[PDB]
Structures are given as C-alpha cells and as structure tokens.
C-alpha cells in the first residue's frame, strides 16, 4: 500500500555544537526506501556531504538524520524525508533553527540598561 | 467543701428591697464570716482555686469563634465555585469515552478549586486570630481595689473570687455582686438592668445590694462579693457602616458589568464555532458523532465561568476588614488601643478635637515655681516659716510622696494623689526640711474638699489651717505676715495693689493660685506660684495637626486667664487676630430665648470663635458638641473627636462621632462609653490616631487600583483573543492562579502598610468625595494600555518575532503550547511588577522606596515570583504551560521591568 509517516518533529531548536536528531517513522507495505532532502528556494534539494557532518541510518520503517557540529550560517532551514516504495512515496517536514552567535546576551544588557535608567531618574528627582 | 452556700446560686441576691429585713437572720458581717471581713485576704493561692471550683469562676466566654473546618465548609458554597466543579466533572466526563493524556484539565480544575478555597479559608482564619489578639488584651486592664493585707493593690477582674472585699468609689464598675458594709452616700446607675436611668441611694438601711454591669455615679464605699461568673445575675440573663457603602455599591456595579461581559464572550464563541463550521465553511456534518460537539460546548462554557471568576472580585469589602485588622494589632504598640471597630476609619475625617487641658496637653507633673512669703515676686524659691511648714506638711493623711523612683539616676520622681498637693510638698522638700518627721505629729477635724465654698481645711494642734484659692479664700483673709512677721490688716489696697497689681502679673498668668491660709477673718501665710509643663512634643503636634485642617478647641473647667496662658503658650490662640475665650457662664447666656438653647443662633454663633471654653461643665461640653454635629452652615460639617474622663462624661462623649478616653487617671464609666482608650494620655497619640485613620482610607484605594487593573486587562485579553481566534489564551487553571494573585493574596499583600508623615499634608476628606479619583483613573488606564499592547504584540506577532511556531489555533487534545507560555509568563510577571507600582497614589516616584517596613509585602511578592518560577518549568501539561527556557525568561523579565518604567513615565503629563 501507500507509505504513511507516523511520528516526527514539526520543529527543532538546537544550539552551537550539538547534534540535531531528525527522524521519520513510516507504516505500510512494503517497507519504503528513505531519502532525506532539503528545501531550498522553493525546490527540494539533495544533501551534499561536503561538510562531513551528515549521518543517515536507514532501517525498514525507521530513519534518523543526525547533523553533528551545527553552525548558524548554513545548517538552519527546512528538511524533509521521503519514504518511497514501489507503490508510492510519502513526505513530512522537519524544520531546524539554531539560536547561537551570542547566544542570549542582548536583553541581559537590556535589563542592566533599564535598571540604570530608572535608578538615574530616582537619583535626579530626590535632589 | 464547707461554706454557707445554702442558696447555692441565689445566695442572697434575689430582689430589692424587701430582702434587707431578713438576710440569713439579718446580720451582714455574720454572713461575711460564714462566707470568708475587714480586713484580711488569703494566704493560700490554692484556696482561691478551691472557691473557683466551689462557686465559682468569673471569666464568661462566648462561643468562639468558629472552627477552621467551619470556614472551609463556608467558602465551598459560592455558586460560581460549585458550577466550576460541575463543569470540570463533565469536562473529564466527555473524555471517558470518545471515538491518551486528555485527562488532566478537569482534575486540575477540581484540585485547584480545592486549593483556592483552602487559601481563602486560611486567610479568614488568620483574620479572626488577630481580632482575638485584640480582644484578649482589651479584656485585661480592668482592675479593682481589693482589701488584701492592708497593702491594697489592683488585681485583674477575672481573678477575683467570693469572700474578698472590694473598696469602690465613684467612677468604676461592679464586677461581682454583693453586700455593703461601710459608708457612704454612694449613688449608682442601674441603666444596664432597669429602664430607670436614674440615681439610687445605697446604705445599710435600704438596699445593701450591688449589681454587676452597673457603674457608680457618685460617693464611695466598701462591699463584700456575693457572686461571679455565669452564677452572677447579669450572666444568667445573658444566658436566657460609613465607608463600606461605597464599596458594596462599587462591587455590585462591577458584578453586573462582568456578568454581562462573560455572557458576551460565551455567545460570541458558540456563534463563531457553529457558523464557522456548520452553516459556513460547510458542508454540514450533522451526524452520529455527537459528544465531541457537546465537548466543545463544555469548553466554551468553561471559558465563560473562568472569566466570571476574574470579573467578579469575590470579597471586596474584606479589604477594609483585613487592613483594619492588621492596623489594630500594630496600633496597639503605639499607645493607642481601639475598642470599637468604626472609630478607626471615621477618624479619619476629623475636623475638630474638643480636648481637655489637665493631663492631656500638659505633663501633669507640676512644680511650685514662684511664691509670696517675702512680700513679693522674688524668683524660684522664721517661726512663722515653721508655721508655714506646719501648713504645707500637715495638709492631709494621704499625701503619699514615695520618693525614690525609677532607676535612681535622674531626679524625676512621681507621686500619688491630687498633684497640686504633691507639687506643694515636693518643693517644700526642696527647702531642705523633713516633712516626714512632722507628719508624725499625729492627726481634730481635717475637712475634705466638701465645703460651702469648697476648700480643704484642717483643725490641728488649736492651729486651724486651710488650703484653697486666692479668689476663693483671700477674700476672707484679714492680714499679711509682715516680712517674717507682723500683721498688716487688709483693704482694697490688697485687692487692687496685690491681687491686681501683683497677683495678675503672674507668669502668663498661670497657674491655679491657692493660699494655705491661717484661720484664727484669716491671715495671709503666702500664696503660690504654680506651673505645669507643656509636653515637649505638643507645640509641634498642634501645628502639625493645625495644618491638616483639624481645628483644636480646648475645653476645660478652669479659670480664667489660665486657659489663655496655656492656649497662647501651646499655639492654639495665635495672637494675631482671633478668637475670643469665655468665662464659663456666658455660653449658657448665648443664647436662650426663652430657655432656650436655640440651635439657630448656637449653630450660627459664635461658631469658629470658641477655641477656649474655660470653666466648663460636662453639660457645657455636651451643649457645645451637640451644637457642632448638626445641620449647620458649610454642609460639609463636621466630624468631631472629643476627649474626656469625668464621671459625668456619659452623653457628650457618647454623641460625638469618635470618642477618646484617658487611661492613666481615667474612670471606668468613661472607658465603657468610649470608643478609643489612650494608654499614656499624650495628645500626640491623637495625632497618631489621625494618621492611622488616614492610612486605612488610603490603603483601600491603594489595593483597589491594582485589583481594577488586573480585572480590566484580564477581561479585554479574554474577550478580544476569544473573538479573533476561537479560544482565550489563558487556560482555565492559570486563570484561577491570576484570581489567587489578585484577590486574596493581593489584598493581604499591599493592604498592610505602615503610615508615613506624608498623610498629614492634605486637607481632610469629605464623606461624599468619590472613591476612584482622577490620578487613580490615570494609573488604571495607563497600565491597562501598556499591558494590552504587550500582550497583543506577544499574542499576534511573537512567532515571526524570535521563536517559535504559532500556538493559535489549536485542537482540543492537546499539546500544551510554547507560545502561550510566553503570553502567560509576560502577563503574570507584568502584574507582579505592577504590584510595586500600585503602591503610590497621590503622586510618584519612589518605587522601590522603601519596601522594607513591610515583612508581608516583601515575602508575598518574592514568594509569588518563586512559585511561578516553579510553575513554569514544572507541571507543564497539567497547568497548560511547557518547559520554558532562557532566553525567553529574560525577555519576559525585560518586559516586566518595562512596565516598571512606563508607569513611572505616567507620573508626568498631569491635568
Ligand atoms: C558523509 O561522509 C562521512 C565520512 O565518511 C560518512 O561517515 C557519512 O556516513 C556520510 N553521510 C552521508 C549521508 O553520506
């Protein structure tokens, strides 16, 4: 019958250096073949292994993409899996986004700046 | 187990006055010795416990107060809560079954309703605990005069027994019934028992019976106890506002408004669902899969009920009662004891304090500043001077100078008795002479104050002497001691050259002249110079009060220039213009046509002019205060706080809006008719009472702007979020958590505030001025606008802002959220940082400053912060949040400090 993916992530937030674990679980008969793709500019693209960081383990009805050593500039985007057999194909979308490059630091400075504003106002009024 | 209890509950106390013909064969001391007379006490502090066990114990209790289980039962009967429980049961009911983890949303409502009703009950229980804490200490202090050893001392009223002796006088109560033995005139009241509010004689011929719960009006005497406790007669028969009108009106208007807004949200939700499914976006799907649709009706109805929980404040007048309770317990440390729970708030709106002079303004530790022995006005301090020592030392038999108190460091002794006499003897001890050596000499007839012209004289060895006033006795005087010395017979030479040209240029010209006169037509021994010190705080205190609109009006029984002296020395009569005093007689003359006391002229005249009403009567003070609280000119007028502690101070102190009663030397009829007992008589304590009365009425609205802000923001978020998407973003448990942060815990948090001295800079309020003022409304609408902007920015566009995917809209089952957690956390932390910014009405800006007088506020705000820190990371799927992490905490705390800054910006732009 037709492939049908059952369990997957609609999103994934990771940070610098961690390992993004993306997966798809399919049902149907026969057990479909797994193709991982990437969405670029309105078109599905293949995964090119020039980074050396892509590791695909495909079993009969289970897959797992594990992208080690994430970086902000390239690795976030949109990913998808393709469970394909002789009857047809199936696809779900798993989206990655990384939070790095400072990472959280900007509103901590915001806190300290606002503390300083209100303390300066209290200093000005009481003199 | 052996006494004379042959009538075991009506031992002699049945009825008057055919009982004195036969009182256990009619012998009063014989019944005393069969029951025990003058004078013995006990030796055994267990013998008192025997007669406690055998007839009986005095302390009579009320059924008190209510069990904690009773209050838990009480607060689980609000109809909103029981409808919420029913719909929670139905909500889990349509989980089991339907064609998983769809189980916790109903269990959370049920258990959380149990928790919120438990917290409200614990609140109300602690409230009653503080009122019991008041009631215990006010049950003390009522002491009596028991003949114990001859070293007669004051014991509390509860530890009195039967068989002992009471030595009563005018001014106090009857704690335990009994039998007269010795003396006297002794008229008593019977207004508590019989309707004859009159004066009744008591003697050993007619009525040797005394009744508890009454109070002696004049005379003195001595009795023996018959009955105590519920065994007493009054106990047997006992066996067989101002502000809150505005709060109830305001709460009923909010109740109607929220009751309609919830129904608006319900109708819109059911209409929007049915139209957007079955009549449009349709394809009608009406089929056999019903209970999912009934399940959505259940979820809509739970949104409606959980908005009615917020939109009706469950107890709003309980703000008054909470704040007044915590205020009572902290007033009690400031010398100021509250006896009726309406004179806290009523004063308040005080405009005039008809005070007294003796003891209330002055220190009541007087001296003898000047003297006239050496013919004239020589400054601060001989066989005729020996005779003068015989006068000044042999005055009485109860002079009672006990002079070595209090820590033997600074020469500041206190005394016992009427204090002019002890001043006299004190600065006759400063002339380095032994008074105690000559006070034995033994005491003929030493007359009391009771005379025709009311002096207090002595006949001793045939040297007859007399104290008493110069305008009372110096008229009768015949001659003057001539520089030790000889005799110079009187004339109006004395009456104009000394009584006018020398006596009237007294200090300012106080005080209270007496003579200590020889008898045998008299002989001028000396006179006086008497001064009592004004307290060191009084001329500041009257000015601080005077700026606050309250016009002090001193009233005393005194004559005549003396009150003028203390008035100008204290600062009442600012001697620029106005106004004039009295002699004592003229206020009864102004006016009666024809007898009289016409309220037209008395209400008119002379109204702002009596700042001094010297030589009063209690009837005169009553006429004045009855004239004040009337339909008068200004139509704001007035609310008065009279003081006073005479025996005859019944009606006047009763009519005025807030009483006051002295509590060092103050009789017990004055305290039972009072409203506030002062404990150390200082007029500054009346100033502190005015401060606390300001504090309650500010603390109400200081609670109310916080509560009104949370109500507006929660209702508009629920309505508008429920009108665009098909649900409200605050799920039904955390809405109850916002209930618990705004309704009971908030009132307990910021309704307890110590006062400042900034509450004494404004004109006092009138009792029709509205409850939500202008700046009030400015803070309301400003913070409401800011929180609507932040909540709708994080509710409609927080997904294309930082991260991540839109929770709106969602199915039933459901995953918790991620985005609605940032909405909920910014909402709750924004209310928590508002809960500091609502601590200032009437202008800004010192927040945080200084929140460290409170223990309660500083534990509740940080405690609620830490509890929400726990609730956000933990218990996600039950409490509809999820595992939130930094950085998102730090943006939410940034927006909380954002409201802390924006409200400070609202301190500008006035009208
Ligand atoms: C990418 O290359 C590495 C290097 O040998 C290899 O271990 C890994 O399996 C490759 N992954 C894919 C998806 O080709």
PDB file of N, CA, C and O in Angstrom, chain B residues 508-565:
ATOM      1  N   UNK B 508       2.016  83.754  82.978  1.00  0.00           N
ATOM      2  CA  UNK B 508       1.270  84.235  81.824  1.00  0.00           C
ATOM      3  C   UNK B 508      -0.279  84.168  81.874  1.00  0.00           C
ATOM      4  O   UNK B 508      -0.889  84.191  80.801  1.00  0.00           O
ATOM      5  N   UNK B 509      -0.999  84.166  83.017  1.00  0.00           N
ATOM      6  CA  UNK B 509      -0.690  84.467  84.412  1.00  0.00           C
ATOM      7  C   UNK B 509      -0.923  83.238  85.265  1.00  0.00           C
ATOM      8  O   UNK B 509      -1.516  83.316  86.335  1.00  0.00           O
ATOM      9  N   UNK B 510      -0.458  82.095  84.774  1.00  0.00           N
ATOM     10  CA  UNK B 510      -0.761  80.842  85.433  1.00  0.00           C
ATOM     11  C   UNK B 510       0.217  80.533  86.554  1.00  0.00           C
ATOM     12  O   UNK B 510       1.343  81.028  86.577  1.00  0.00           O
ATOM     13  N   UNK B 511      -0.209  79.678  87.490  1.00  0.00           N
ATOM     14  CA  UNK B 511      -1.476  78.958  87.417  1.00  0.00           C
ATOM     15  C   UNK B 511      -2.151  78.895  88.781  1.00  0.00           C
ATOM     16  O   UNK B 511      -1.524  79.262  89.779  1.00  0.00           O
ATOM     17  N   UNK B 512      -3.446  78.520  88.749  1.00  0.00           N
ATOM     18  CA  UNK B 512      -4.215  77.822  89.809  1.00  0.00           C
ATOM     19  C   UNK B 512      -3.806  78.195  91.232  1.00  0.00           C
ATOM     20  O   UNK B 512      -3.370  77.361  92.028  1.00  0.00           O
ATOM     21  N   UNK B 513      -3.945  79.478  91.532  1.00  0.00           N
ATOM     22  CA  UNK B 513      -3.481  80.023  92.794  1.00  0.00           C
ATOM     23  C   UNK B 513      -4.265  79.452  93.969  1.00  0.00           C
ATOM     24  O   UNK B 513      -5.476  79.255  93.876  1.00  0.00           O
ATOM     25  N   UNK B 514      -3.545  79.105  95.044  1.00  0.00           N
ATOM     26  CA  UNK B 514      -4.102  78.837  96.367  1.00  0.00           C
ATOM     27  C   UNK B 514      -3.302  79.639  97.388  1.00  0.00           C
ATOM     28  O   UNK B 514      -2.373  80.355  97.033  1.00  0.00           O
ATOM     29  N   UNK B 515      -3.660  79.505  98.668  1.00  0.00           N
ATOM     30  CA  UNK B 515      -3.119  80.362  99.723  1.00  0.00           C
ATOM     31  C   UNK B 515      -2.411  79.627 100.850  1.00  0.00           C
ATOM     32  O   UNK B 515      -1.408  80.138 101.356  1.00  0.00           O
ATOM     33  N   UNK B 516      -2.929  78.467 101.275  1.00  0.00           N
ATOM     34  CA  UNK B 516      -2.539  77.778 102.513  1.00  0.00           C
ATOM     35  C   UNK B 516      -2.731  78.700 103.720  1.00  0.00           C
ATOM     36  O   UNK B 516      -1.779  79.145 104.359  1.00  0.00           O
ATOM     37  N   UNK B 517      -3.997  78.989 103.999  1.00  0.00           N
ATOM     38  CA  UNK B 517      -4.372  80.084 104.879  1.00  0.00           C
ATOM     39  C   UNK B 517      -4.439  79.679 106.346  1.00  0.00           C
ATOM     40  O   UNK B 517      -4.843  78.565 106.688  1.00  0.00           O
ATOM     41  N   UNK B 518      -4.017  80.608 107.199  1.00  0.00           N
ATOM     42  CA  UNK B 518      -4.275  80.584 108.630  1.00  0.00           C
ATOM     43  C   UNK B 518      -5.750  80.899 108.880  1.00  0.00           C
ATOM     44  O   UNK B 518      -6.423  81.508 108.046  1.00  0.00           O
ATOM     45  N   UNK B 519      -6.266  80.477 110.036  1.00  0.00           N
ATOM     46  CA  UNK B 519      -7.673  80.690 110.349  1.00  0.00           C
ATOM     47  C   UNK B 519      -7.902  81.639 111.519  1.00  0.00           C
ATOM     48  O   UNK B 519      -8.465  82.718 111.323  1.00  0.00           O
ATOM     49  N   UNK B 520      -7.434  81.297 112.717  1.00  0.00           N
ATOM     50  CA  UNK B 520      -7.752  82.047 113.941  1.00  0.00           C
ATOM     51  C   UNK B 520      -6.690  81.861 115.012  1.00  0.00           C
ATOM     52  O   UNK B 520      -6.308  80.734 115.323  1.00  0.00           O
ATOM     53  N   UNK B 521     -12.171  86.542 108.563  1.00  0.00           N
ATOM     54  CA  UNK B 521     -11.003  86.795 109.388  1.00  0.00           C
ATOM     55  C   UNK B 521      -9.978  85.679 109.340  1.00  0.00           C
ATOM     56  O   UNK B 521     -10.158  84.634 109.961  1.00  0.00           O
ATOM     57  N   UNK B 522      -8.892  85.914 108.603  1.00  0.00           N
ATOM     58  CA  UNK B 522      -7.860  84.911 108.372  1.00  0.00           C
ATOM     59  C   UNK B 522      -6.482  85.555 108.477  1.00  0.00           C
ATOM     60  O   UNK B 522      -6.335  86.617 109.086  1.00  0.00           O
ATOM     61  N   UNK B 523      -5.452  84.902 107.948  1.00  0.00           N
ATOM     62  CA  UNK B 523      -4.134  85.512 107.841  1.00  0.00           C
ATOM     63  C   UNK B 523      -3.417  84.962 106.614  1.00  0.00           C
ATOM     64  O   UNK B 523      -3.304  83.746 106.433  1.00  0.00           O
ATOM     65  N   UNK B 524      -2.918  85.871 105.780  1.00  0.00           N
ATOM     66  CA  UNK B 524      -2.218  85.525 104.546  1.00  0.00           C
ATOM     67  C   UNK B 524      -0.850  84.934 104.826  1.00  0.00           C
ATOM     68  O   UNK B 524       0.105  85.678 105.063  1.00  0.00           O
ATOM     69  N   UNK B 525      -0.726  83.611 104.831  1.00  0.00           N
ATOM     70  CA  UNK B 525       0.568  82.975 105.044  1.00  0.00           C
ATOM     71  C   UNK B 525       1.451  83.230 103.833  1.00  0.00           C
ATOM     72  O   UNK B 525       2.517  83.845 103.941  1.00  0.00           O
ATOM     73  N   UNK B 526       0.995  82.777 102.674  1.00  0.00           N
ATOM     74  CA  UNK B 526       1.673  83.003 101.408  1.00  0.00           C
ATOM     75  C   UNK B 526       0.657  82.799 100.308  1.00  0.00           C
ATOM     76  O   UNK B 526      -0.535  82.705 100.608  1.00  0.00           O
ATOM     77  N   UNK B 527       1.074  82.742  99.046  1.00  0.00           N
ATOM     78  CA  UNK B 527       0.173  82.075  98.120  1.00  0.00           C
ATOM     79  C   UNK B 527       0.826  80.929  97.343  1.00  0.00           C
ATOM     80  O   UNK B 527       0.805  79.788  97.814  1.00  0.00           O
ATOM     81  N   UNK B 528       1.516  81.226  96.245  1.00  0.00           N
ATOM     82  CA  UNK B 528       1.834  80.230  95.210  1.00  0.00           C
ATOM     83  C   UNK B 528       2.869  80.800  94.266  1.00  0.00           C
ATOM     84  O   UNK B 528       3.136  82.004  94.267  1.00  0.00           O
ATOM     85  N   UNK B 529       3.456  79.924  93.463  1.00  0.00           N
ATOM     86  CA  UNK B 529       3.479  80.126  92.025  1.00  0.00           C
ATOM     87  C   UNK B 529       3.462  78.765  91.362  1.00  0.00           C
ATOM     88  O   UNK B 529       4.411  78.004  91.541  1.00  0.00           O
ATOM     89  N   UNK B 530       2.445  78.445  90.567  1.00  0.00           N
ATOM     90  CA  UNK B 530       2.233  77.077  90.112  1.00  0.00           C
ATOM     91  C   UNK B 530       2.317  77.036  88.596  1.00  0.00           C
ATOM     92  O   UNK B 530       1.833  77.943  87.910  1.00  0.00           O
ATOM     93  N   UNK B 531       2.967  75.995  88.077  1.00  0.00           N
ATOM     94  CA  UNK B 531       3.161  75.818  86.646  1.00  0.00           C
ATOM     95  C   UNK B 531       3.189  74.321  86.381  1.00  0.00           C
ATOM     96  O   UNK B 531       3.930  73.592  87.044  1.00  0.00           O
ATOM     97  N   UNK B 532       2.397  73.874  85.417  1.00  0.00           N
ATOM     98  CA  UNK B 532       2.599  72.545  84.879  1.00  0.00           C
ATOM     99  C   UNK B 532       3.283  72.656  83.527  1.00  0.00           C
ATOM    100  O   UNK B 532       3.047  73.627  82.802  1.00  0.00           O
ATOM    101  N   UNK B 533       4.186  71.753  83.188  1.00  0.00           N
ATOM    102  CA  UNK B 533       4.899  71.883  81.920  1.00  0.00           C
ATOM    103  C   UNK B 533       4.075  71.303  80.786  1.00  0.00           C
ATOM    104  O   UNK B 533       3.504  70.217  80.901  1.00  0.00           O
ATOM    105  N   UNK B 534       3.976  72.071  79.705  1.00  0.00           N
ATOM    106  CA  UNK B 534       3.561  71.517  78.437  1.00  0.00           C
ATOM    107  C   UNK B 534       4.569  70.451  78.038  1.00  0.00           C
ATOM    108  O   UNK B 534       5.772  70.591  78.284  1.00  0.00           O
ATOM    109  N   UNK B 535       4.070  69.344  77.475  1.00  0.00           N
ATOM    110  CA  UNK B 535       4.924  68.309  76.909  1.00  0.00           C
ATOM    111  C   UNK B 535       5.843  68.907  75.843  1.00  0.00           C
ATOM    112  O   UNK B 535       5.486  69.882  75.180  1.00  0.00           O
ATOM    113  N   UNK B 536       7.043  68.347  75.672  1.00  0.00           N
ATOM    114  CA  UNK B 536       7.963  68.888  74.660  1.00  0.00           C
ATOM    115  C   UNK B 536       7.513  68.673  73.223  1.00  0.00           C
ATOM    116  O   UNK B 536       8.065  69.313  72.323  1.00  0.00           O
ATOM    117  N   UNK B 537       6.528  67.814  72.977  1.00  0.00           N
ATOM    118  CA  UNK B 537       6.094  67.491  71.628  1.00  0.00           C
ATOM    119  C   UNK B 537       4.860  68.263  71.196  1.00  0.00           C
ATOM    120  O   UNK B 537       4.620  68.390  69.991  1.00  0.00           O
ATOM    121  N   UNK B 538       4.072  68.739  72.152  1.00  0.00           N
ATOM    122  CA  UNK B 538       2.809  69.445  71.940  1.00  0.00           C
ATOM    123  C   UNK B 538       2.882  70.645  70.993  1.00  0.00           C
ATOM    124  O   UNK B 538       2.064  70.684  70.064  1.00  0.00           O
ATOM    125  N   UNK B 539       3.793  71.628  71.124  1.00  0.00           N
ATOM    126  CA  UNK B 539       3.732  72.766  70.190  1.00  0.00           C
ATOM    127  C   UNK B 539       4.130  72.408  68.780  1.00  0.00           C
ATOM    128  O   UNK B 539       3.799  73.153  67.855  1.00  0.00           O
ATOM    129  N   UNK B 540       4.823  71.293  68.588  1.00  0.00           N
ATOM    130  CA  UNK B 540       4.957  70.734  67.252  1.00  0.00           C
ATOM    131  C   UNK B 540       3.683  70.016  66.840  1.00  0.00           C
ATOM    132  O   UNK B 540       3.265  70.106  65.680  1.00  0.00           O
ATOM    133  N   UNK B 541       3.066  69.302  67.780  1.00  0.00           N
ATOM    134  CA  UNK B 541       1.956  68.421  67.447  1.00  0.00           C
ATOM    135  C   UNK B 541       0.729  69.211  67.030  1.00  0.00           C
ATOM    136  O   UNK B 541       0.056  68.857  66.058  1.00  0.00           O
ATOM    137  N   UNK B 542       0.438  70.301  67.738  1.00  0.00           N
ATOM    138  CA  UNK B 542      -0.727  71.114  67.409  1.00  0.00           C
ATOM    139  C   UNK B 542      -0.519  71.823  66.080  1.00  0.00           C
ATOM    140  O   UNK B 542      -1.460  71.990  65.304  1.00  0.00           O
ATOM    141  N   UNK B 543       0.719  72.197  65.767  1.00  0.00           N
ATOM    142  CA  UNK B 543       0.982  72.822  64.475  1.00  0.00           C
ATOM    143  C   UNK B 543       0.832  71.818  63.341  1.00  0.00           C
ATOM    144  O   UNK B 543       0.227  72.127  62.304  1.00  0.00           O
ATOM    145  N   UNK B 544       1.346  70.602  63.546  1.00  0.00           N
ATOM    146  CA  UNK B 544       1.242  69.547  62.543  1.00  0.00           C
ATOM    147  C   UNK B 544      -0.204  69.143  62.323  1.00  0.00           C
ATOM    148  O   UNK B 544      -0.606  68.819  61.203  1.00  0.00           O
ATOM    149  N   UNK B 545      -1.007  69.194  63.376  1.00  0.00           N
ATOM    150  CA  UNK B 545      -2.422  68.889  63.244  1.00  0.00           C
ATOM    151  C   UNK B 545      -3.168  70.055  62.611  1.00  0.00           C
ATOM    152  O   UNK B 545      -4.054  69.861  61.775  1.00  0.00           O
ATOM    153  N   UNK B 546      -2.802  71.276  62.991  1.00  0.00           N
ATOM    154  CA  UNK B 546      -3.432  72.518  62.578  1.00  0.00           C
ATOM    155  C   UNK B 546      -3.308  72.726  61.084  1.00  0.00           C
ATOM    156  O   UNK B 546      -4.233  73.227  60.442  1.00  0.00           O
ATOM    157  N   UNK B 547      -2.169  72.329  60.523  1.00  0.00           N
ATOM    158  CA  UNK B 547      -2.021  72.370  59.072  1.00  0.00           C
ATOM    159  C   UNK B 547      -2.934  71.366  58.381  1.00  0.00           C
ATOM    160  O   UNK B 547      -3.331  71.589  57.235  1.00  0.00           O
ATOM    161  N   UNK B 548      -3.329  70.297  59.065  1.00  0.00           N
ATOM    162  CA  UNK B 548      -4.130  69.256  58.448  1.00  0.00           C
ATOM    163  C   UNK B 548      -5.623  69.534  58.516  1.00  0.00           C
ATOM    164  O   UNK B 548      -6.424  68.609  58.366  1.00  0.00           O
ATOM    165  N   UNK B 549      -6.023  70.782  58.732  1.00  0.00           N
ATOM    166  CA  UNK B 549      -7.414  71.162  58.699  1.00  0.00           C
ATOM    167  C   UNK B 549      -8.141  71.032  60.020  1.00  0.00           C
ATOM    168  O   UNK B 549      -9.157  71.701  60.226  1.00  0.00           O
ATOM    169  N   UNK B 550      -7.649  70.188  60.916  1.00  0.00           N
ATOM    170  CA  UNK B 550      -8.294  69.965  62.199  1.00  0.00           C
ATOM    171  C   UNK B 550      -8.078  71.162  63.103  1.00  0.00           C
ATOM    172  O   UNK B 550      -6.940  71.541  63.378  1.00  0.00           O
ATOM    173  N   UNK B 551      -9.161  71.749  63.590  1.00  0.00           N
ATOM    174  CA  UNK B 551      -9.075  72.903  64.471  1.00  0.00           C
ATOM    175  C   UNK B 551      -9.279  72.464  65.914  1.00  0.00           C
ATOM    176  O   UNK B 551     -10.398  72.132  66.310  1.00  0.00           O
ATOM    177  N   UNK B 552      -8.203  72.464  66.694  1.00  0.00           N
ATOM    178  CA  UNK B 552      -8.276  72.095  68.096  1.00  0.00           C
ATOM    179  C   UNK B 552      -9.064  73.134  68.879  1.00  0.00           C
ATOM    180  O   UNK B 552      -8.864  74.336  68.719  1.00  0.00           O
ATOM    181  N   UNK B 553      -9.970  72.674  69.738  1.00  0.00           N
ATOM    182  CA  UNK B 553     -10.742  73.588  70.576  1.00  0.00           C
ATOM    183  C   UNK B 553     -10.648  73.109  72.017  1.00  0.00           C
ATOM    184  O   UNK B 553     -11.349  72.175  72.398  1.00  0.00           O
ATOM    185  N   UNK B 554      -9.810  73.756  72.814  1.00  0.00           N
ATOM    186  CA  UNK B 554      -9.642  73.325  74.193  1.00  0.00           C
ATOM    187  C   UNK B 554     -10.848  73.702  75.032  1.00  0.00           C
ATOM    188  O   UNK B 554     -11.339  74.827  74.968  1.00  0.00           O
ATOM    189  N   UNK B 555     -11.338  72.742  75.805  1.00  0.00           N
ATOM    190  CA  UNK B 555     -12.416  72.949  76.762  1.00  0.00           C
ATOM    191  C   UNK B 555     -11.962  72.404  78.103  1.00  0.00           C
ATOM    192  O   UNK B 555     -11.495  71.267  78.184  1.00  0.00           O
ATOM    193  N   UNK B 556     -12.094  73.200  79.156  1.00  0.00           N
ATOM    194  CA  UNK B 556     -11.750  72.719  80.486  1.00  0.00           C
ATOM    195  C   UNK B 556     -12.635  73.382  81.522  1.00  0.00           C
ATOM    196  O   UNK B 556     -13.329  74.359  81.246  1.00  0.00           O
ATOM    197  N   UNK B 557     -12.599  72.829  82.729  1.00  0.00           N
ATOM    198  CA  UNK B 557     -13.179  73.515  83.861  1.00  0.00           C
ATOM    199  C   UNK B 557     -12.090  74.214  84.643  1.00  0.00           C
ATOM    200  O   UNK B 557     -11.461  73.600  85.510  1.00  0.00           O
ATOM    201  N   UNK B 558     -11.885  75.501  84.376  1.00  0.00           N
ATOM    202  CA  UNK B 558     -10.720  76.208  84.887  1.00  0.00           C
ATOM    203  C   UNK B 558     -10.957  77.700  84.711  1.00  0.00           C
ATOM    204  O   UNK B 558     -11.833  78.116  83.956  1.00  0.00           O
ATOM    205  N   UNK B 559     -10.149  78.504  85.393  1.00  0.00           N
ATOM    206  CA  UNK B 559     -10.475  79.915  85.499  1.00  0.00           C
ATOM    207  C   UNK B 559      -9.229  80.788  85.613  1.00  0.00           C
ATOM    208  O   UNK B 559      -8.302  80.456  86.356  1.00  0.00           O
ATOM    209  N   UNK B 560      -9.180  81.879  84.844  1.00  0.00           N
ATOM    210  CA  UNK B 560      -9.926  82.089  83.607  1.00  0.00           C
ATOM    211  C   UNK B 560      -8.823  82.352  82.611  1.00  0.00           C
ATOM    212  O   UNK B 560      -8.804  81.839  81.497  1.00  0.00           O
ATOM    213  N   UNK B 561      -7.877  83.168  83.075  1.00  0.00           N
ATOM    214  CA  UNK B 561      -6.677  83.503  82.327  1.00  0.00           C
ATOM    215  C   UNK B 561      -5.753  82.312  82.136  1.00  0.00           C
ATOM    216  O   UNK B 561      -4.872  82.365  81.270  1.00  0.00           O
ATOM    217  N   UNK B 562      -5.935  81.265  82.941  1.00  0.00           N
ATOM    218  CA  UNK B 562      -5.098  80.076  82.888  1.00  0.00           C
ATOM    219  C   UNK B 562      -5.181  79.396  81.533  1.00  0.00           C
ATOM    220  O   UNK B 562      -4.158  79.007  80.943  1.00  0.00           O
ATOM    221  N   UNK B 563      -6.393  79.272  81.013  1.00  0.00           N
ATOM    222  CA  UNK B 563      -6.575  78.662  79.712  1.00  0.00           C
ATOM    223  C   UNK B 563      -6.007  79.547  78.612  1.00  0.00           C
ATOM    224  O   UNK B 563      -5.486  79.043  77.614  1.00  0.00           O
ATOM    225  N   UNK B 564      -6.055  80.871  78.797  1.00  0.00           N
ATOM    226  CA  UNK B 564      -5.412  81.777  77.841  1.00  0.00           C
ATOM    227  C   UNK B 564      -3.907  81.603  77.834  1.00  0.00           C
ATOM    228  O   UNK B 564      -3.275  81.629  76.767  1.00  0.00           O
ATOM    229  N   UNK B 565      -3.327  81.414  79.018  1.00  0.00           N
ATOM    230  CA  UNK B 565      -1.899  81.169  79.152  1.00  0.00           C
ATOM    231  C   UNK B 565      -1.486  79.919  78.397  1.00  0.00           C
ATOM    232  O   UNK B 565      -0.573  79.949  77.563  1.00  0.00           O
TER     233      UNK B 565
END
